Amino acid sequence: QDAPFGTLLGYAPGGVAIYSSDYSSLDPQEYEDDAVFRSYIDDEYMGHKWQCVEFARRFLFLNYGVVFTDVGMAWEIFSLRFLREVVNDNILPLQAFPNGSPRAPVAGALLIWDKGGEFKDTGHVAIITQLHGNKVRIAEQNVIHSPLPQGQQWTRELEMVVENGCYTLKDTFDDTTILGWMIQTEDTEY
Template identity: 25%
Template sequence: MKKTIITLLLICLSIYLYVNAKNPTNKPPNNKITVKSNQIKCGDSIGSHNGITAYYNDGFNSCGSGRHMSSDGYSYGFKWQCVEYIRRYYKDYYKHEMSRWGNASDYFRNNLAHGAINTERNLIQYKNGHTEKPKEGDILVFQNIAPPYGHVRLVTKVNGSVINVIEQNTGTSCYSTLGLSKNGNNWLISDECTGFLRKEE
């Protein structure tokens, strides 16, 4: 019993001496301060595609507030939501404007035929898992992410079985990849993508 107590005391003493050697002033380590000073702040730039910047929005918690408006009065959407990036990209890069209403899930109209014009966005709409392959500039719509709001991503590149995308409101990185597979003549995008929209050439 005595031997056990002495052993425990020696272990405790060793831990105490180790901690104090690492932190001799007995002040708590400043790890939190370091993390805070390196944190990305709301509205900070986290990347871009074709010169259109994506901004940090603290994931789905949304740290932005109010609408983001263009110089000519067009509503990009609420800062810095996923829809805001899509609307700003299409307006600033393609000079294409869309109806301002709706969440990301509303960008895909479930009753439209594959390849029909989505008149609310004035874009061609394609269903996932059909004959059309996605390409750069397409808007991918995910109705099953964070329902009923949904999520949208912009295709930046398609390379074999990998789709590169840029997006807002998903954390500190705006870049991610999705899988693309082919079954016969049909193309399937991963992550339960509902479908995609494309500007007519």
């Protein structure tokens, strides 16, 4: 059963908390405007409590010391080309790999959905946490709002088809569109 807004549901790898995002009983006006809904970790802005972008930015901050910049819609992350190291403001390259790419997803990668279906007009972002032969595990906010089983540090598992040198992820929802994954690397592909 779904938990009240802000409830701790579990942790992603590295001890990164996953919180419930059900804001159905909150005033939309208030939810959008009030500063109590802004998540920070030591003066660093992580995002809007407790949306998908906030979790992805906080996961990268806590486990890699980097963040991506302030997008209005999650699907816009797929068009970013850098990450910022918070300790010194240095810029690191970030590349996009469309679903079905011969460049395999990797743990830590951002996984982005375009707008559509379950993800309406915002799209979605999750973090890939584990790679297996026929699936990946991911962690995210704004999808699962019920506590995770003890010891489970992922929210969903997605089927991964590996054929003819390409990797294709299939969503657990039927009406969505996965754009692809992002990896911290320079563009070294034609």
